From a paper:
In the present study, we conducted a fluorine-scan, similar to the one described by Olsen et al. for the serine protease thrombin, to characterize thermodynamically and kinetically the active site of human Carbonic Anhydrase II (hCAII) by kinITC with fluorinated compounds 3–14. We herein present high-resolution crystallographic and ITC data of a series of variously 4-substituted BSAs with additionally different degrees of fluorination in ortho and meta position of the central aromatic portion. As sulfonamides are known to bind hCAII as anions, a proton from the sulfonamide group must be released into the surrounding medium. The reason for the small detected amount of 0.1 moles L−1 supports the assumption that, prior to sulfonamide binding, the fourth vertex of the tetrahedral ZnII complex is occupied by a hydroxide ion.
As anticipated, the crystal structures underscore conserved binding modes and the attached 4-substituents are all placed toward the entrance of the funnel-shaped binding pocket. The 4-substituent orients toward the opening of the funnel-shaped active-site pocket and is partly exposed to the solvent environment. A comparison of para-substituted compounds 5 and 15–17 and unsubstituted prototype 1 shows, that for electron withdrawing groups, a gain in affinity is mainly enthalpy-driven, while an electron-donating group in 17 causes a loss in affinity due to an entropic penalty. To reduce complexity, we first want to analyze compounds 1, 5, 15–17, which do not cause major structural perturbations in the active site. A correlation between the pKa value and both ΔG° and kon can be inferred, but not between pKa and koff values. A small set of chemically diverse, only para-substituted BSAs shows that an increasing acidity provides for a faster association process.
Residue numbers in the entry: 4 to 125, 127 to 261
Write the structure that this text describes.
């Protein structure tokens, strides 16, 4: 099955997921000089005050913090988006060392990690239908750099010892994702794809310009997770990022002048 190793990583995915070589793949490098302010973007609204987190799962690729998406409890609207997008899960991608780990890059610079808050367009009723639509998903991406600790991340860090291996989950109620945001909502946006198989071209990407700072200790705990299942030889969950893909016939727009 697909993964991040030499034998099953990003360079192999196209053999089972031919869209890997598609016209709208993610992530991309964000060339900040070529990105253009877009006056047509509406104000972005991140409305997470009624979010209901449920569970945290090690899926063998990353860990997902899952939300109740049976109503509009935690939604993303505005910006480039037409309609309401409901938060379903968040997860991260990270490196074996602080100099890599992000999926998007900024003028080719790699951050230590990247947070993805995944949302689906409610006009399609369910996530599965949304991933049959060009505008089915919106992913809010946030870079992580290593410096001061992020207080709102610590609850995530501290539960990871209970989901070390693939297939393990734990209750994760009453987590507030607002504690993972930076101060500014300035962003870049472009049309792209899921960054893991099935690589579907359904995503409006919204990538915040301001990184969050996390401590070395916090990211080191991410790197203690395992790709493998319980009882199997240990494969540390590190370098679970896809590199930048060709921009092709796209432009990256900025929310800021
Ligand atoms: N195309 S893939 O990345 O899903 C994939 C890579 C390798 C193997 N393999 O070695 O069996 C299977 C599937
Ligand atoms: N990494 S990502 O945010 O583009 C992503 C989100 C969701 C899924 N998914 O549901 O399969 C895959 C990848
Ligand atoms: O408990 C985490 C969060 O859950 C939300 O549903 C509440 O409205 C927030 O006030 C709270 O911070
Ligand atoms: O034809 C001019 C237009 O070219 C497009 O590629 C740009 O996205 C627009 O901002 C510009 O007004
Ligand atoms: O908010 C997420 C989680 O944080 C801590 O682990 C709390 O002990 C737990 O009750 C909660 O579910
Ligand atoms: Zn992701």
């Amino acid at each position: 099955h697909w993964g991040y190793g030499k034998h099953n990583g990003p360079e192999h995915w196209h053999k089972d997921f031919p869209i890997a070589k598609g016209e709208r793949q993610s992530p991309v490098d964000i060339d900040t000089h070529t990105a253009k302010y877009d006056p047509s973007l509406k104000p972005l609204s991140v409305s997470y005050d009624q979010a209901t987190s449920l569970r945290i799962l090690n899926n063998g690729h990353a860990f997902n913090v899952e939300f109740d998406d049976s109503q509009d409890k935690a939604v993303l609207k505005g910006g480039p988006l037409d309609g309401t997008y409901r938060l379903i899960q968040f997860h991260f991608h990270w490196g074996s060392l602080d100099g890599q780990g992000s999926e998007h890059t900024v003028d080719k610079k790699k951050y230590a990690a990247e947070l993805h808050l995944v949302h689906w367009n409610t006009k399609y009723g369910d996530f599965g239908k949304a991933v049959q639509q060009p505008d089915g998903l919106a992913v809010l991406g946030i870079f992580l750099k290593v410096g001061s600790a992020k207080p709102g991340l610590q609850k995530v860090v501290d539960v990871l010892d209970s989901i070390k291996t693939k297939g393990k989950s734990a209750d994760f109620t009453n987590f507030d994702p607002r504690g993972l945001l930076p101060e500014s909502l300035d962003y870049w946006t472009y049309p792209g794809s899921l960054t893991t198989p099935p690589l579907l071209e359904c995503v409006t990407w919204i990538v915040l310009k301001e990184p969050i700072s996390v401590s070395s200790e916090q990211v080191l705990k991410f790197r203690k997770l395992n790709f493998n299942g319980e009882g199997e030889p240990e494969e540390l969950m590190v370098d679970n990022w896809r590199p930048a893909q060709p921009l092709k016939n796209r432009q990256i727009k900025a929310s800021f002048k």
